[PDB]
Amino acid sequence: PIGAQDERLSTLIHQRMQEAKVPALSVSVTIKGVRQRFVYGVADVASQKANTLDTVYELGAMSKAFTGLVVQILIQEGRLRQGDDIITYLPEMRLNYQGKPASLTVADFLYHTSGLPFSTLARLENPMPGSAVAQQLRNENLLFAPGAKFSYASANYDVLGAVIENVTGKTFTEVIAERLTQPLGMSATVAVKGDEIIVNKASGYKLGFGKPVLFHAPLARNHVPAAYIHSTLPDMEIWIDAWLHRKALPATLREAMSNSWRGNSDVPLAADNRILYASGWFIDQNQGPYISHGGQNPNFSSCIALRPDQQIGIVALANMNSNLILQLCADIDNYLRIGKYADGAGDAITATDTLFVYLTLLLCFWGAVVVVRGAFRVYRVRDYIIALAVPGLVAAMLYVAPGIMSPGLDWRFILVWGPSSVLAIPFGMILLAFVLTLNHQIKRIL
Amino acid sequence: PIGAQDERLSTLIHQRMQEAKVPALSVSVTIKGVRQRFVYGVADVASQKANTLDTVYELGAMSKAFTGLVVQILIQEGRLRQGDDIITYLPEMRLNYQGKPASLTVADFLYHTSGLPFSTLARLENPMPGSAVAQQLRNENLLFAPGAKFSYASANYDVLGAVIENVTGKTFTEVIAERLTQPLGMSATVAVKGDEIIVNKASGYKLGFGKPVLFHAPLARNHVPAAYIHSTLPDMEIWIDAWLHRKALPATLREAMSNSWRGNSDVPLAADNRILYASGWFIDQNQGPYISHGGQNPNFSSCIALRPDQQIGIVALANMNSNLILQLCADIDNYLRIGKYADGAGDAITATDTLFVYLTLLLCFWGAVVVVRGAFRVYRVRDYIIALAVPGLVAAMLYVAPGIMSPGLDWRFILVWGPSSVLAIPFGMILLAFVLTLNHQIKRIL
Ligand SMILES: [Cl-]
Ligand SMILES: [Cl-]
Ligand SMILES: [Cl-]
Ligand SMILES: [Cl-]
Ligand SMILES: [Cl-]
Ligand SMILES: [Cl-]
């Protein structure tokens, strides 16, 4: 009775999938009760394990709507106030502004008005077994007064995870399960505790030399509330369906939802962007309301978009980081709205991969110019010690160069988020520097 | 009775003015009937002529709201249809898509859904005495099907200027005066016919080597409807006031206004931008409605913003191109809304000026290394002919390099829009290339 799914929808999704080169991609579209599912590709490439509805994905920053709804549930029960100071729950977290400890509220983390620098993502995403969030951020220097500006920082929702635990006295996992996944019936959603083996989880990939490459990304327990809630497409359908049909929902959960979609208007807006952030969702009233959020991980990415007044919900899930997946929801919504859609935008990882492939061939053409000029002059101890300084000196500068241009970012961070080809640039430079040393020393020796 | 103007408003405006380094800046703010005026600096620097309320500015792209309201007036009278094909009025303008002539409507130019490439701005802004717009754009190749995408192109409103003339049988100047400036009472607003002398017009400036520099910019008659309507602050106050109080207005002008603020929803929207374009205005419903448009000329810039439901109107006018002036209206509106505002954004011209100043000193440090190494070896006909090839060859490549990287842009365009320092880079390269030739030829001569 429901009829066939839309064939022009399938073309768009396929095309975006082939452009992005993600191995697996799952998409689901609700329009007033009728869903359309699009499940393509492979969750694991080497074993050829198929993308099925049981495949489990990391939700990326779409984790934050879970964390924030829980903050709203605890507020609705009266175990928390939006305006509570964070020090009441995280007594050891001193965060500074202009040298003085600052007053940061719970709202300041909900709405990314905290001033936490971008580098806090490097700190919170590296595993630290016996280390609490408050110690990891202790004595960070904020970028502005709290509440003065919107500035997205993923670590803002790891502070909130830690507040949930102090308030309930329970682990994040238990609070998520007991307050959200059990009562909504999302029987395959979970907040993980680390990288214990999750059956059905897709393998994650990252672009490198033009092909997807298997990448085992870190999964730090303290970072779960901002990045690493795991789920499946049927479950995200139930999640969508809940936000759209809050009638048969208990009154606490319904009220917490209503307050979870209340954007923070007390910030400056740009000339081209008056969109508001709520409790882990962007709120846009233009051709709206249009509630969306994207997920971006080192080896996963995803998006979600809701248009409540027309009962539309879009979610897409993929086991690779691609801007074409962060935009796919806007594409699908353009199609559902006016029957047309833009050409795929670019992708930052893919452009960077190409840049390195060129640079690496450039560094290889240079090695040939040195060795072709070398077998020319060749066919016609203190040397070995001096020539190891040129590569070892460039390799030393390359080592500390990240920490100087951007204080707080290290090579670990670069490797985690960049193309797999990113290591060829230093080593190619190291190899080119070693050979260039031997040439200009053996040319004075003639 | 009205009270003092707001002192925190004055600080913000002063500060933005000193950051941007514009010589003169005029700002006016309406909030339910009470205006606040801020008139600072100098309209002409060499003669020290003061910025007064009589100072006349080029409105930049804020010209388009004038052109488009006239299109709406002619539509309301029934002398034009939104959906009319452009060829009915510009019979010689053939514009191609995929090799075939395309059907472009009047709406396609109103809402920047035409496919006109960015380079059409270079063509329409260079003076051409006996040359009509339709001949200047004849056989351009569009970037996409008409109506398929929003893509801003200033030449879209020069096509509309030409439609107004064919329909009325009158010049653009006469139609603007008779339909808008006379009936609204804006007795100092005019659409110019070229660079005849306009008493009271401010001098225009462009950044160069860190200081503002007097710049005589082109003013091509065919480009007036998109860039070069001239006006004053009292007159822009009357303009604002008209859009906000359409009651005592004749019914044709009131209806044309209502249709002039109707955004075009039939385009794809980005994930972070669902704002619509209307008849020369951006329409944003977020914290709105917020109707705005900025003006950007080579040596002027300006902005306007209206919030009709709260009777707010902001306009700013300056005799230099600065992003800090394109954003000033958003700043003022943030202040009027929540009493706070962001730090000034960057400026593309100023960053580019600094980049060149560094490059030019780099090219000068290189000349010293060559001449210091030269007076060293010096104190211890076929040469003059060979050494003029290195600079003349680099000067040839520099000449055609713009037309190769971006087809349709020439050095004329670069000089018009870039920092005054932009010429030092080629000539410094030319001088460095000539000296480098003499060094490696007189070093083989030893
Ligand atoms: Cl509990
Ligand atoms: Cl445990
Ligand atoms: Cl935003
Ligand atoms: Cl007439
Ligand atoms: Cl004339
Ligand atoms: Cl837009």
Author numbering:
A (entry chain A), B (entry chain A): 35 to 414, 430 to 495
Anything the authors wrote about it?
Colibactin, a DNA cross-linking agent produced by gut bacteria, is implicated in colorectal cancer. Its biosynthesis uses a prodrug resistance mechanism: a non-toxic precursor assembled in the cytoplasm is activated after export to the periplasm. Although the transmembrane domain is required for colibactin activation, its role in catalysis is unclear.
To better understand the role of the ClbP TMD in enzymatic function, we determined the crystal structure of full-length ClbP embedded in a lipid mesophase. Seeking structures in the presence of substrate analogs, we initially focused on the catalytically inactive S95A variant. Early S95A crystals yielded electron density maps that clearly showed the position of individual transmembrane helices, although their resolution was insufficient to assign the registry or helix connectivity pattern. To overcome this challenge, we mutated non-conserved TMD positions to methionine—L454M and I478M—and used anomalous diffraction data from selenomethionine-substituted crystals to locate these sequence markers in electron density maps. We obtained two high-resolution structures of S95A-L454M-I478M: selenomethionine-substituted ClbP and methionine-containing ClbP bound to a product analog. The resulting high-quality maps allowed us to fully model the TMD helices and unambiguously assign their registry. The two structures are nearly identical (root mean squared deviation (RMSD) = 0.15 Å over the Cα carbons of residues 38–414 and 431–491), except for the extent to which the TMD’s intracellular loops are modeled; we base our analysis below on the higher-resolution product-bound structure. We initially crystallized S95A-L454M-I478M in a precipitant solution supplemented with compound 1 and obtained a 2.7-Å structure that suggested that monoolein, the crystallization lipid, was bound at the active site. In our model, the headgroup of monoolein forms polar interactions with active site residues S188 and H257. The chemical similarity to myristoyl-d-asparagine suggests that monoolein acts as a substrate mimic.
